[PDB]
């Protein structure tokens, strides 16, 4: 049909955000190490329909936070955004593009395929500048937000300096079963506990 | 330099903007859009609002200056001074732009993000010919009541829109920095739509 079509991959913003501030960063890096949350990130961004592959799209600084031994993130099309990029694909298969608009156009011309595999989902994986722009892009279909809560001792609280500029009243939180349907995986329900943190996996779609 | 916008709400197709020193309609959500847009700035930045002397006088004194924004008022009779509240009383757009630039486009150590020209008709009709204006933010207002109740207006834009081109909605949102309703909004006997325009070239 013409409503909620399938002519391009769905686009998700996926982030882990500290409540209530939507804090995401401290001194240029991630303020917590949540082992199972990072497993969820890998599992979700890698899970694709048979014979498909997903993309991960990120700002240049977030790319630079990934240890070199991890690059490019395995099993996914990696796209890096930098204003001076030349919209080229390098010898490692990494896409270096100058805007989200430019990479979306290039993928469409290639039939949303990457090395003879169709794309399933496109995930925007950070960082702050990219999230603050793309929350306004009408093409974004949903948010995958891990809501992170610090429950430890006051001395151990994370010292945050970077926050999402997102208006969640423009979005609506979905039922857990809808999250599972979208990501293609069984997902823990409710609060998960690790160390000094609790966290919950959530999915949001546009309001109204 | 900061980008410069003319921001206006105008009745279609006459481009009427006022009647007897007030707006011809009472649209609470449209006024909130104006407030949200003109106040939305990058962290540590501030926006300016530039207006003619007569529109300044229409703001109730208790609400002057418009909070959270650098207020500039144009009157041929101003001495180019900054008052105790930080209000810029300037004699021309020229003079205030040259002063802001000599200050590195900063106000109290905050860089200017955007400069908004907020009316009224005399300022709009002059400044739409100023090469420094980058875009128009036009709320297109439509009267949708009965013919017997159609509004009277006394003040109008004189704009040649053939010199401008309307942008897609996502470009409006990116510029103003906010998620903005698309298409026609309804309040009472009026519908209205938020639009953005750049120079046609
Ligand atoms: N889930 C979480 O909690 C996450 C948190 N983060 C946090 O985010 C922070 C880093 O965010 P940030 O510093 O904003 O860096 P980003 O990862 O957003 O990369 C910023 C760079 O992206 C490029 N860029 C920005 N806007 C555009 C554009 N419109 N078009 C093209 N390229 C663009 C520029 O690269 P150039 O300068 O080369 O032009 C800019 O310097 C860190 O604290 C990190 O920990 C990161 C990911 C997820
Ligand atoms: N719908 C909308 O979006 C808006 C509607 N309005 C409506 O517009 C009407 C008011 O508009 P208008 O009557 O045109 O008044 P303006 O707000 O344009 O103020 C006109 C005054 O601006 C000063 N001025 C004009 N040209 C110059 C210049 N070249 N250099 C310096 N100063 C200058 C003069 O002040 P002096 O005489 O002191 O020199 C002049 O009297 C009202 O009905 C109001 O409600 C107002 C704003 C927006
Ligand atoms: C925080 C984490 C691990 N979890 C999550 N839910 N969303 C995102 N984007 N995440 C992330 C992924 C890759 C990079 Cl390089 C930086 C941060
Ligand atoms: C690659 C990812 C998500 N997966 C993993 N297993 N370990 C780490 N450190 N990871 C990471 C996390 C945050 C940032 Cl900012 C950059 C890379
Ligand atoms: C009409 C309104 C509220 N909405 C809009 N879109 N543009 C402008 N300039 N507006 C306005 C703002 C302040 C003043 Cl004092 C007079 C009119
Ligand atoms: C600027 C604004 C919205 N803010 C406020 N607090 N009160 C009033 N009257 N305002 C107003 C509305 C229309 C016109 Cl023509 C002039 C000023």
Author numbering:
A (entry chain A): -4 to 203
B (entry chain B): 3 to 203
Recite the paper's sentences:
This coenzyme is required for a variety of cellular processes, including the synthesis of purine involved in nucleic acid and amino-acid biosynthesis. The active site is located in a cleft formed by α-helix 1, α-helix 2, α-helix 4 and β-sheet 1, similar to CglDHFR and CalDHFR. As classified in E. coli DHFR, CauDHFR could also be designated to have two subdomains: the nucleotide subdomain, in which the NADPH sits, and the substrate-binding subdomain, which is predominantly formed by α-helix 1, α-helix 2 and β-sheet 1.
In order to reveal the binding modes of PYR and CYG, we obtained the ternary complexes CauDHFR–NADPH–PYR and CauDHDFR–NADPH–CYG. CYG1 binds in an almost identical manner to PYR, but a secondary CYG2 also binds within the active site. For CYG2, the pyrimidine region interacts with the positively charged lip region, which is classically occupied by glutamate moieties, and the phenyl group occupies the apolar region that is classically occupied by the PABA moiety, stacked above the first CYG compound. The ternary complex with CYG only has slight conformational differences compared with the ternary complex with PYR, except for Phe65, which moves by 2.6 Å. This is most likely to be due to the steric clash that would arise in the ternary complex with CYG if it was in the same position as in the ternary complex with PYR. The Leu60 residue is shifted towards the NADPH molecule in both ternary complexes, being shifted 1.4 and 2.1 Å from the apoenzyme and holo­enzyme, respectively, with respect to CauDHFR–NADPH–PYR and 1.1 and 1.6 Å, respectively, with respect to CauDHFR–NADPH–CYG. The exception to this trend was CYG, with a significantly lower IC50 than would be expected from the thermal shift at 401 µM.
